[PDB]
Amino acid sequence: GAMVETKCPNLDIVTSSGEFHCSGCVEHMPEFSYMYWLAKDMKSDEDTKFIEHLGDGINEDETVRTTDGGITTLRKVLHVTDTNKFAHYRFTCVLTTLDGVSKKNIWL
């Protein structure tokens, strides 16, 4: 009931035990949108990689898609279970839409 504009995506990353929770919204053509995580070893010169190409100790859950008041929210959990292995990694949540891309970084 807040009488203010809605900002999208308003990307946010929340932490819980062993987990990063990314959330963001999309309003325009929400069916063409997706969220995914990326990671980069900032200690090495290896490229940015998809989560599934990092080997053991990490995984991302399927995105959860909800809608309310005409706005779709996407949420995606990244589980980092080997925090030693990924201590020097930069993680990035990406939300892609038809209007463009939004990204937010986080570190352990």
Place this chain on the structure above:
Amino acid sequence: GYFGKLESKLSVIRNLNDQVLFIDQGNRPLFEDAPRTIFIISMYKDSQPRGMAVTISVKSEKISTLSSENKIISFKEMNPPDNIKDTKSDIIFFQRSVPGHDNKMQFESSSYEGYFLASEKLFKLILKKEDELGDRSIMFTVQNE
């Protein structure tokens, strides 16, 4: 960096004249006033995020994938792969909402920046440097099946 396949949508694609894109008997992407009209738009995540990356494919006795190779639009006989290792790819297009035509789509070649899928009058799908604002020929209606 590289691309990874995510979900697909079955799609009918129409140009500004309300003509439907189809793959003809010669594997040419044409527009006309049914399975050769059902396109599969597959979304890809990108390790170098730049926009919504897609492949466009069609099942008509085997699967054909749209290509912008050699700056010509054609179909290649292949499944859109689960990973694309190239930073630019002949089969990847960036799909956008059209500025000022908020219900319409445009598809930029990832291989040739600023070149777009366009309807050209046969009515052909062609690849087209956008030279002018509000060029309707690069605008598409993408309807959900």
